Design a protein around this ligand. Structure first.
Ligand SMILES: CCCCCCCCCCCCCCCCCC(=O)OC[C@H](COP(=O)([O-])OCC[N+](C)(C)C)OC(=O)CCCCCCCCCCCCCCCCC
Ligand SMILES: CCCCCCCCCCCCCCCCCC(=O)OC[C@H](COP(=O)([O-])OCC[N+](C)(C)C)OC(=O)CCCCCCCCCCCCCCCCC
Ligand SMILES: CCCCCCCCCCCCCCCCCC(=O)OC[C@H](COP(=O)(O)OCCN)OC(=O)CCCCCCCCCCCCCCCCC
Ligand SMILES: CCCCCCCCCCCCCCCCCC(=O)OC[C@H](COP(=O)(O)OCCN)OC(=O)CCCCCCCCCCCCCCCCC
Ligand SMILES: CCCCCCCCCCCCCCCCCC(=O)OC[C@H](COP(=O)(O)OCCN)OC(=O)CCCCCCCCCCCCCCCCC
Lengths: 71, 96, 112, 317, 111, 344, 172, 80, 69, 96
């Protein structure tokens, strides 16, 4: 259950970080939406920059550096 | 990221002009032991984020020889001062 | 984020009290005879620091006994394990490998 | 209000090193059949607040033949690590929950000798030049007498944290299953932290104690101060390790009451040893580490490796 | 890549705390056993957790009824059970060992 | 002292086995780490203040030459993370690899490792033990071989005999004359290594034999070239005939068997349409022969045995494995149709 | 407190080396290592592995840095001096000191300048880049130190040190 | 030789106590049957998660219900 | 044997302060409960989950069975 | 030369600690465990001289799994896609 409540978080995180990226700029020297960096179409794990993009204000620091330097 | 450029810039604490020169040879053996932690750290940043789970015993073993290595090199640097009293790398007698 | 503000308090309280003793209440411009005195309760020591062999071997010997306690350090973490005949018989090796290095050197120490 | 907790721990412990200097001599006085500080107190109790202000009035000279940036940097590192070591220490709750902090004690107890190597060098000549070189030499050799038999109980504790070191002793008072190790645990800290029978650091008739020999009462006031901060800290570290008290979560008040009473008792012994025994004459000091202390410590080390296995009593972690 | 919509999200989420989740927690997993063990085969035996979203709700929906049963039948010894174990520090199980049978006086019997 | 002299001497060759028996860059780091730990006592034995001021010039040259190797490992740790001993997957790593290891074998740059050590060690007795340290890194360049830049390995090798040749015509001290032409015989084998890396080992096994038998001849008294005069008519005139035969063999003359490598090694260097490369080196080792002629013009022409001193007694040194060295180091040129099918 | 607490440590560590890489009179050479050794341990005490960082105090900074200062008295005992009070020390201090800022100056302070100097950017929170979390085993980094599988490793390094004493039981 | 274990214990009883603890430490794991329970306890402590298997023909044992009499004997510890 | 007991009783109290102070900060800053410790990264995952769902921004307030009914 | 004793007689002197996907003492893989096992599957009986120019797909993504070179560039350029238009609207997304 704790697994099945965690994977639902990142798909919400991927959807909002893409849908509020696809409405940002649609340039002809720009990106396609729905692509991947890799050739292989298989579900690799995401990255910190995938989940938490260019925002990086407060809560992203507590996500990375939370377990380190204290409870 | 930039956490590797610093520190790969810090690997240039060899720099060979100051790896045997100038005199007070203790200043040169200094950066020979200080060239470690530019290898002990540069390994430790790579084994740890990419969870290898097994190669992290290698940074423990990286100190164990280089301590015993430099301890041997420090034994001989007493022997150059046991015969003189000063190390002074501009001592040279056996030509080449 | 207090580890790291758990010690920078402790060092800025440390460097506070030393400069309110070495500096401030100090400044000895009056008579303050700093002449040739203050020589550590003695006179002029025209000799330099001489080499002492029996106080060098104490440095190196410790260093080679200091390394293989860090090999010996993850013994409590080597308890909750798999195959343990290996774990016991290898743990006993290093201690004997430390013990022989005594007994060879033990036939010549010197007045340490 | 985390910042109000740190100041609530540095300040109430500077009294307990100032109100130990007074009990340094009252206890040492009734052994000689004589009263304590009799006239100024009334009972003595107001002596150290008068005996502190005199030092900071009296002129703090620097020696003319001394160096500059080294001589006034070692008392910075003196009180730094003498007070930083009090952090990860449970009573019953520590200020900091380190995952592995037993090793952090040796990460703090190792660098204290790197100030004696400074101050003996930083000021001046032979009464602290060579006379402090042979004080670094004794303190380095009593880590391998220390670090081994510190590890020799961790095979029975289970891990490196200190909360397990109170959990494993709820029914034992662990001085009984390891009482040979508990002997050499004492004499190590009795000689590492530079005390009365194995002395040459402070100095009786040795280097006429040439590790202070030069500090006037400005910078000297901490050296003594800082140093007395180690001796009540190895006592607060022995009594959380061997002679462990009982913790109750519903009543944390009764922990400390039954706890501070015990570290005080071991602290008496550092006073009660000094009024009996003479010195050790530097050879015989180190002649009993290698030849005599050390081979037993490996012997019990191999004993404490096999005995958790051949009892099928592995500690859980 | 292609993702499912904003729908097939936003399900009835179990909004409880950590200790009350760890309160029962032991009677929980050992008696449902149809949606959750099969969900592991839906995750281990085939990867890509973007295909496997049905049984992520099968484990969740039955867990909604597990706490809904315990509220109606017997919640008076339950709320005091995770009260004492929430008196914190590592959440030990040997402190409230005395008060564990007053919760389980009827969990074996009533329901 | 006697038993511990073996245990030091035994672990020297145990250090170099782990260099060869390894599938893992960490173990080849340990392998010739402890060789640099277990040579330093052999430098010392009689404690003379040149020897202490020679091993310390030996030491830190093989500390850095150690240290750059571990730098070369951790670079391609980042790239693909495989640690088998194979191609290094990065031109910034392999460049830092080959010209780090060129100090232990010393090539023409990284120069004075070779004369400044071997001269004036009072242990001239041997110091045949400087054939293991030519043998450990060659066992590393057999695997790394299909990843090099092909210019650096030749430019260290074209300079090798052009400067190992010129360096010793200006000498008398026959340890330096043995220290020189030891860079030259490291020039012939690594000029070939990109092209068919076996028929390199043929040159090495020959080089161990002909050099080991040179030092054993030298262990009667011989120190200097003027001392190489005064033993023809004094010690044994058969020694003068023997010391002629090996030098004329080691120069590469086709009636003897030091011409066995070149004759075969040009069969590989051309067949690869590279002709101006061997014609430079083959004419370069010609003034590598003017060491040996003008050395043979000392002992074999009775040049002034003066200062009458009689050795009316016999000789009892240990010339171990000497009776079989100038019978495979001279007469083997007919008997090797395939030595390069045993070693291949 | 910032996201840039790792990058702000390492510049000190780079400047720790340039402290003793030039020529400081080998008693301030100790004040180049202990500074760098702690600051370098400030990097390693992130990322999860704390046991591997705390050992760098005990065995390097606790062991070798006493003996490196337990000498420089029994040898090299001339009349001491300080660095930067001479002309040969300060002339090399500034030489990398610009590049210690100049490398930082355009690696990413421009937008993307231009092709070769923009592949590696500063920040942001992808320096750690370890999401998501793990399990109750260890960090790990915790179940890594093994008297399991590696036995050939330990039987060398145990035995390599045993000849380490016998080489130094002689000449001295 | 039987006096040598009594005429050095009148001179240096320091290292004699070390060998007495060095010995009788290697010897005992080959003796008591308490060991190999030290490996038996240490084998059935679950760290990771038990992934299930699939029915395909066999069906060897252990059906979908865990509290059935299905698995091996690790329940002697609760009686211990 | 008398006057030495006031000398003890000033030192002995001076270590009763920091034990009682820290034990009544963690119990007071988090509202009459002990402070959550987290040695393993799994144990952090419960708190950082609980902060997202407890009431506002805290790991020290409870939700209860009656929350979801 | 590479004698390879440890292939004749079946002891592993090392071997285990060599690649990123070998044993994992309690079975915790790396971040690119899926591409190690896939790429080693490519070149097994292949003699590695044709593997450099034939396989070439299962290696390149694995290099880009490990450093994330273009993934960080496609991310960095989105900071220049927007974020000159800070003042030209499109906050996107509003919190949360
Ligand atoms: C066999 C392996 C067990 C490890 C033991 C390592 C040596 C432990 C020390 C043994 C102490 C014995 C003391 C009394 C010996 C009787 C005196 C005598 O006649 O000399 C014999 C001696 C015992 O050695 P020794 O230590 O008593 O004194 C010899 C003097 N030195 C050290 C300078 C050589 O035997 C030898 O000299 C030969 C051995 C060479 C040195 C030992 C290292 C190699 C060990 C053999 C492999
Ligand atoms: C050698 C066998 C070891 C395995 C034995 C299995 C257990 C047997 C139980 C003990 C039986 C009695 C042991 C015999 C002891 C004889 C040694 C002796 O007499 O010492 C002579 C000599 C004494 O020479 P000494 O005259 O200089 O005496 C000085 C002794 N001290 C330093 C204590 C004051 O001792 C030695 O040569 C060896 C000293 C090094 C010992 C290293 C300790 C090893 C650490 C544990 C591993
Ligand atoms: C003269 C005045 C000028 C000098 C002023 C500066 C002097 C400072 C000297 C202080 C030296 C102390 C260094 C000690 C380092 C050891 C710290 C440590 O290890 O903390 C333990 C902890 C380990 O992590 P863990 O236990 O797993 O946390 C629990 C997670 N559940 O780790 C943690 O909790 C968090 C780890 C990250 C915390 C930040 C990094 C700590 C180090 C910061 C200072 C850098 C060191 C400065 C150089 C030292 C010089 C001596
Ligand atoms: C088979 C089953 C298993 C068997 C298990 C058996 C267990 C046995 C346990 C034995 C090991 C523990 C004992 C530790 C050894 C004692 C240390 C030692 O060896 O000291 C020897 C020292 C040397 O001197 P000596 O040999 O006597 O020669 C001079 C005679 N003219 O001579 C000395 O005596 C020196 C005395 C100590 C020196 C310091 C004294 C200063 C004051 C210290 C007082 C400490 C009091 C107690 C400490 C606190 C205790 C809580
Ligand atoms: C018949 C053997 C020679 C006559 C008896 C030995 C006399 C002698 O000792 O001289 C050895 C001589 C070395 O010459 P030299 O040293 O200058 O003379 C001074 C010797 N005190 O010459 C030598 O004999 C040295 C050995 C040279 C190699 C053997 C050749 C000797 C001939 C006998 C073997 C014949 C079979 C081998 C050759 C077959 C050819 C097909």
């Amino acid at each position: 259950l704790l697994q099945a409540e965690k994977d639902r978080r990142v798909l919400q995180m991927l959807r909002e970080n893409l849908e509020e990226e696809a409405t940002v700029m649609k340039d002809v020297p720009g990106w396609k939406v729905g692509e991947s960096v890799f050739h292989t179409t298989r579900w690799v794990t995401p990255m910190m920059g995938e989940l938490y993009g260019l925002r990086a204000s407060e809560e992203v620091l507590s996500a990375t550096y939370g377990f380190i330097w204290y409870t | 990221s930039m956490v590797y450029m610093n520190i790969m810039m810090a690997f240039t604490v060899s720099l060979v002009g100051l790896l045997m020169y100038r005199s007070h040879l203790m200043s040169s053996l200094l950066c020979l032991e200080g060239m470690m932690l530019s290898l002990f750290v540069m390994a430790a940043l790579t084994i740890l984020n990419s969870h290898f789970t097994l190669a992290s015993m290698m940074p423990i073993i990286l100190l164990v020889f280089a301590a015993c290595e430099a301890a041997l090199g420090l034994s001989l640097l007493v022997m150059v001062s046991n015969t003189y009293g000063t190390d002074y790398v501009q001592n040279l007698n056996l030509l080449q | 984020m207090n580890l790291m503000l758990a010690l920078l308090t402790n060092f800025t309280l440390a460097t506070l009290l030393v400069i309110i003793a070495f500096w401030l209440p100090q400044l000895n411009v009056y008579s303050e005879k700093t002449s040739p005195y203050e020589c550590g309760f003695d006179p002029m020591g025209s000799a330099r620091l001489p080499f002492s062999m029996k106080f060098f071997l104490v440095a190196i010997t410790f260093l080679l006994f200091d390394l293989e306690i860090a090999l010996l350090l993850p013994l409590p973490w080597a308890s909750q394990t798999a195959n343990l005949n290996t774990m016991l018989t290898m743990a006993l090796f290093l201690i004997i490998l430390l013990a022989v290095s005594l007994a060879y050197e033990w036939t010549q120490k010197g007045l340490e | 209000m985390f910042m109000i907790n740190i100041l609530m721990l540095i300040i109430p412990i500077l009294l307990a090193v100032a109100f130990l200097t007074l009990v340094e001599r009252k206890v040492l006085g009734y052994m000689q059949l004589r009263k304590g500080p009799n006239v100024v107190g009334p009972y003595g109790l107001l002596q150290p607040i008068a005996d502190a202000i005199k030092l900071f009035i009296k002129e703090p000279l620097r020696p003319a033949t001394s160096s500059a940036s080294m001589f006034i940097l070692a008392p910075i590192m003196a009180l730094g690590l003498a007070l930083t070591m009090w952090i990860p220490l449970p009573m019953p709750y520590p200020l900091i929950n380190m995952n592995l902090g037993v090793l952090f004690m040796l990460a703090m107890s190792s660098l204290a000798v790197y100030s004696i190597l400074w101050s003996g060098w930083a000021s001046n000549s032979k009464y602290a030049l060579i006379g402090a070189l042979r004080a670094v030499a004794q303190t380095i050799s009593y880590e391998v007498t220390l670090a081994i038999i510190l590890l020799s109980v961790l095979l029975m504790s289970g891990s490196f944290t200190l909360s397990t070191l109170i959990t494993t002793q709820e029914q034992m008072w662990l001085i009984l299953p390891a009482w040979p190790l508990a002997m050499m645990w004492f004499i190590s800290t009795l000689a590492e932290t530079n005390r009365a029978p194995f002395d040459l650091t402070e100095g009786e008739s040795e280097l006429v104690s040439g590790f202070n020999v030069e500090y006037a009462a400005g910078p000297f006031a901490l050296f003594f101060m800082a140093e007395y901060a180690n001796i009540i800290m190895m006592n607060i570290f022995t009594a959380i390790l061997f002679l462990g008290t009982s913790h109750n979560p519903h009543m944390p008040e009764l922990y400390t009451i039954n706890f501070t009473i015990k570290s005080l008792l071991l602290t008496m012994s550092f006073l009660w040893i000094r009024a009996s025994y003479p010195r050790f004459r530097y050879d015989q000091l180190m002649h009993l580490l290698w030849k005599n202390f050390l081979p037993l410590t490996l012997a019990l080390c191999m004993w404490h490796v096999s005995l958790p296995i051949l009892t099928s009593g592995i500690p859980p972690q | 890549v292609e993702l499912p919509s904003l729908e097939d999200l936003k399900v009835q989420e179990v909004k409880v705390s950590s200790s009350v989740l760890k309160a029962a927690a032991h009677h929980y997993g050992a008696q449902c056993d149809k949606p959750n063990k099969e969900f592991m085969l839906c995750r281990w035996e085939e990867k890509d957790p973007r295909r496997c979203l049905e049984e992520g709700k099968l484990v969740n929906q039955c867990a909604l009824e597990f706490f809904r049963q315990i509220k109606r039948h017997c919640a008076e010894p339950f709320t005091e059970y995770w009260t004492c174990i929430d008196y914190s520090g590592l959440q030990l199980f040997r402190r409230c060992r005395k008060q564990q049978a007053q919760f389980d006086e009827c969990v074996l019997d009533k329901l | 002292n006697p038993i511990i002299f073996i245990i030091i001497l035994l672990t020297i060759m145990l250090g170099t086995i782990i260099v060869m028996i390894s599938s893992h860059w960490l173990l080849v780091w340990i392998g010739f780490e402890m060789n640099m730990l277990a040579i330093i006592p052999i430098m010392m034995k009689n404690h003379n203040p040149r020897a202490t001021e020679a091993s310390t010039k030996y030491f830190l040259t093989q500390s850095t030459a150690s240290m750059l190797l571990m730098m070369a490992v951790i670079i391609n740790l980042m790239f693909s993370g495989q640690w088998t001993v194979m191609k290094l997957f990065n031109p910034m790593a392999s460049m830092l690899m080959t010209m780090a290891l060129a100090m232990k074998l010393g090539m023409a740059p990284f120069h004075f490792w070779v004369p400044e050590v071997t001269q004036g060690i009072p242990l001239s007795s041997g110091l045949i033990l400087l054939t293991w340290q030519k043998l450990a890194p060659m066992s590393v360049l057999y695997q790394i071989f299909p990843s090099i830049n092909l210019n650096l390995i030749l430019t260290l090798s074209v300079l090798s005999i052009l400067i190992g040749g010129w360096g010793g015509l200006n000498q008398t001290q026959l340890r330096k004359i043995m220290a020189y032409s030891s860079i030259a015989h490291m020039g012939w084998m690594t000029a070939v290594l990109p092209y068919n890396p076996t028929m390199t080992l043929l040159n090495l096994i020959i080089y161990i034999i002909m050099t080991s038998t040179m030092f054993t001849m030298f262990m009667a008294n011989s120190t200097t070239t003027t001392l190489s005069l005064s033993h023809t008519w004094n010690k044994t005139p058969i020694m003068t005939v023997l010391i002629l035969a090996t030098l004329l063999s080691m120069g590469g003359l086709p009636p003897l068997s030091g011409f066995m490598p070149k004759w075969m090694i040009i069969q590989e260097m051309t067949k690869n349409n590279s002709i101006i490369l061997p014609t430079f080196m083959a004419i370069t080792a010609l003034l590598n022969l003017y060491f040996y002629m003008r050395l043979t013009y000392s002992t074999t022409l009775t040049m002034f045995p003066s200062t009458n001193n009689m050795k009316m007694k016999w000789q009892f040194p240990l010339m171990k494995k000497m009776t079989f060295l100038p019978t495979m180091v001279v007469l083997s040129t007919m008997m090797l149709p395939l030595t390069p099918m045993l070693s291949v | 407190m910032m996201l840039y607490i790792v990058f702000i440590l390492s510049v000190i560590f780079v400047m720790g080396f340039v402290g003793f890489s030039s020529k400081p009179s080998p008693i301030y050479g100790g004040l180049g290592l202990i500074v760098s050794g702690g600051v370098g341990c400030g990097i390693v005490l992130n990322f999860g592995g704390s046991f591997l960082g705390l050992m760098v105090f005990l065995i390097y900074l606790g062991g070798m840095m006493v003996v490196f200062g337990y000498t420089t008295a029994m040898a090299t005992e001339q009349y001491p001096e300080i660095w930067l009070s001479n002309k040969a020390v300060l002339g090399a201090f500034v030489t990398g000191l610009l590049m210690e800022f100049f490398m930082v100056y355009y690696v990413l302070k421009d937008k993307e300048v231009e092709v070769v100097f923009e592949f590696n950017g500063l920040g942001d929170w992808v320096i750690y880049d370890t999401g998501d979390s793990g399990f109750f085993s260890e960090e790990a980094m915790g179940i890594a130190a093994l008297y399991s599988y590696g036995t050939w490793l330990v039987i060398v390094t145990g035995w390599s040190l045993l000849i380490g004493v016998v080489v130094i039981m002689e000449i001295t | 030789v039987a006096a040598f274990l009594k005429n050095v214990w009148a001179k240096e009883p320091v290292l004699v106590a070390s060998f007495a603890i060095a010995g009788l430490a290697v010897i005992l794991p080959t003796l008591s049957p308490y060991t190999k329970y030290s490996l038996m306890i240490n084998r059935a402590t679950p760290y990771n998660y038990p992934v299930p298997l699939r029915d395909d023909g066999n069906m060897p044992d252990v059906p979908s219900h865990p509290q059935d009499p299905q698995g091996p004997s690790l329940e002697w510890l609760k009686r211990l | 044997w008398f006057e030495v007991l006031p000398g003890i009783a000033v030192m002995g109290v001076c270590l009763f302060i920091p034990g009682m102070a820290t034990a009544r900060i963690h119990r007071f800053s988090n509202g009459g409960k002990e402070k959550r410790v987290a040695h393993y990264p799994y144990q952090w995952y419960l708190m950082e989950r609980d902060r997202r769902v407890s009431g506002v921004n805290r790991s020290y307030v409870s939700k209860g069975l009656e929350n979801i009914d | 030369p590479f004698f390879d004793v440890q292939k004749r007689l079946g002891v592993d002197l090392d071997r285990w600690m060599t690649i990123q996907s070998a044993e994992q003492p309690h079975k915790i893989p790396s971040r690119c465990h899926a591409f190690e096992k896939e790429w080693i599957e490519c070149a097994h009986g292949i003699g590695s001289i044709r593997a450099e120019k034939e396989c070439k797909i299962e290696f390149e993504d694995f290099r880009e799994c490990l450093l994330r070179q273009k993934t960080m560039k496609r991310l960095h350029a989105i900071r220049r896609q927007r974020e000159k238009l800070i003042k030209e609207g499109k906050y996107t997304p509003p919190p949360h």
